[PDB]
Subunit: 134 residues, 2 copies
């Protein structure tokens, strides 16, 4: 499927909202939403949001100097193979609120400063209808 990759050249702020609408393919294994601090794929990640249909988990993490931080997991998997979805990733001063299906799903406290974010990447086993930054 077609990944999304777009620049946020001045960072993000409390009140930035990433709105993603799409479809999980019926044979999906995993997909990801990354907020990265650079234009490279090994650059630091303020947020790695990784729904894993194969292992029935949604993992949250950060990455700094090529090392992953402590994983967090959301409660259950609010995605389903074959089904459309709406995700909001909402930046506050304290962290990211992941909203799925118009219900608060998980709160991930920041590890990296919002001002360092430079790139949003959405890829893997996912079909995207829209990716918007508000």
């Amino acid at each position: 499927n077609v990944p999304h990759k777009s620049s946020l050249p001045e960072g993000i702020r409390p009140g930035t909202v990433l709105a993603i609408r799409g479809l999980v393919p019926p044979n999906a294994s995993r997909f990801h939403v990354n907020l990265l601090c650079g234009e490279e794929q090994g650059s630091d990640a303020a947020l790695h949001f990784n729904p894993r249909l194969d292992t029935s988990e949604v993992v949250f993490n950060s990455k700094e100097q090529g090392s992953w931080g402590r994983e967090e997991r959301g409660p259950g998997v609010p995605f389903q193979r074959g089904q459309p979805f709406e995700v909001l990733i909402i930046a506050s001063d304290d962290g990211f609120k992941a909203v799925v299906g118009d219900a608060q799903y998980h709160h991930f406290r920041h590890r990296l400063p919002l001002a360092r974010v430079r790139l949003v990447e959405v890829g893997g086993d996912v079909q995207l209808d829209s990716v918007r930054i508000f």
Copy 2:
């Protein structure tokens, strides 16, 4: 039916008000208010007022019983008889209105955010959901 719900801990940058519903075929106007309290005539940090009758969307505040100076969004992204989805997003700088998953208008803060303690949705509107994230 109107929505009125309390925000016990207030709202902060990163608060999102998500409203989904339908503009009735005979609608005149509806409103979304971010209010400082449960009473009649409370200060309003934000009054978001789509006006089907006059083809405008008015934004304003209210302090000491007096409406402030109105701002107007670009066009009216609502239609009688049609469903809509609105996000009202609080930032450090103001409130961002998103309609139909498109950025619509930005209203810079006038009142301190920490005084907002109530959300009200009323007027000519049928609500499917009101959620605060």
